[PDB]
Amino acid sequence: ALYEDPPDQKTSPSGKPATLKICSWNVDGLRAWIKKKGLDWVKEEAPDILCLQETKCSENKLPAELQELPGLSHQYWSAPSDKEGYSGVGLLSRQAPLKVSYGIGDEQEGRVIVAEFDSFVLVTAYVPNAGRGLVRLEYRQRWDEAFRKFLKGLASRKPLVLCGDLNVAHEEIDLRNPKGNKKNAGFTPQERQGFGELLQAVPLADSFRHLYPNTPYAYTFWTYMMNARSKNVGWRLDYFLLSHSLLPALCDSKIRSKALGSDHCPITLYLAL
């Protein structure tokens, strides 16, 4: 019940070489993640685009080591006004996006950045957690609806890549304890339904599951507590979702289980654009 990520497939089914590498990572504390060597791993992974969620760091406190990534020199940050110490996302890109926007239209929690590139639009998101004891599930349900709507009036323009921490394991294969977590944040019925609606309405494909429909034990998050990470007791909360039009560009969708620094691990997408 431990998992070994298959090797990197850097060739599309029509046989073209991957031209774009996107890495997404919930860092659960950007400053702590940086002190735990996250930027060293990123530099090794060398993505063209790096998305980060749950930064928990205001723009004024962004450590200057981030400017020491000249291969990801264009950096955009979204932080909440009200909340201090919670939320926050970032998008770092080798090339400048044609346009960058923040939020989902009715603002400000610092959860979503939208970067328009030449061939596609990239959304990164830190979806609100339903909370211990489902306290914020009502907020989460309305956010899902708003987000779904926002994304619809977006993929109507160009193909869409949505990455980040969606805070839900879609199906049972997506977590280690399906039956014990049916009323816990991330596996409620309302939350699994919302993910399904996300996929139906936009529409989007789950990159990893498209490529690995039968693969179990593939998680991107483990609670710090107990030793869940060491025992692979975890959840797949972090996704790359794509418009159908992009499936022929899809070379691979990775889970970087070995990379430390957070209670989530990175995920990496390869596309042949």
Numbering used by the authors: 43 to 149, 153 to 318
Paper text:
To further probe the role of the catalytic metal, we solved additional rAP:APE1 complex structures in the presence of MnCl2. Using this approach, we were able to obtain both substrate and product crystals with Mn2+ bound within the APE1 active site, which diffracted to 2.57 and 2.00 Å, respectively. One advantage of using Mn2+ in crystallography is that its position in the structure can be validated by identifying its anomalous signal. In the rAP product structure, Mn2+ sits in the metal binding pocket, overlaying with the Mg2+ of the deoxy-AP structure, and coordinated by E96, D70, D308. Since both the Mn2+ metal ion and the 5′ phosphate cannot simultaneously occupy this pocket, the phosphate group of the rAP has shifted out of the pocket in the Mn2+ bound structure, where it now overlays with the position of 5′ phosphate in the deoxy-AP structure. This shift, compared to the non-metal bound structure, places the phosphate group in position to be coordinated by the same residues as the deoxy product (N174, N212, D210, Y171, H309). In addition to this main conformation, a second conformation was identified in the Mn2+ bound rAP product structure at only 25% occupancy. In the second conformation, the rAP phosphate is shifted into the metal binding pocket, as seen in the non-metal bound product structure, again highlighting the conflict that exists between the metal and the phosphate group. The existence of two alternate conformations of the nicked rAP site in this structure resulted in globular density that prevented accurate determination of the sugar pucker. Together, this data suggests that the APE1 catalytic metal helps to organize the APE1 active site during cleavage of an abasic ribonucleotide embedded in DNA.
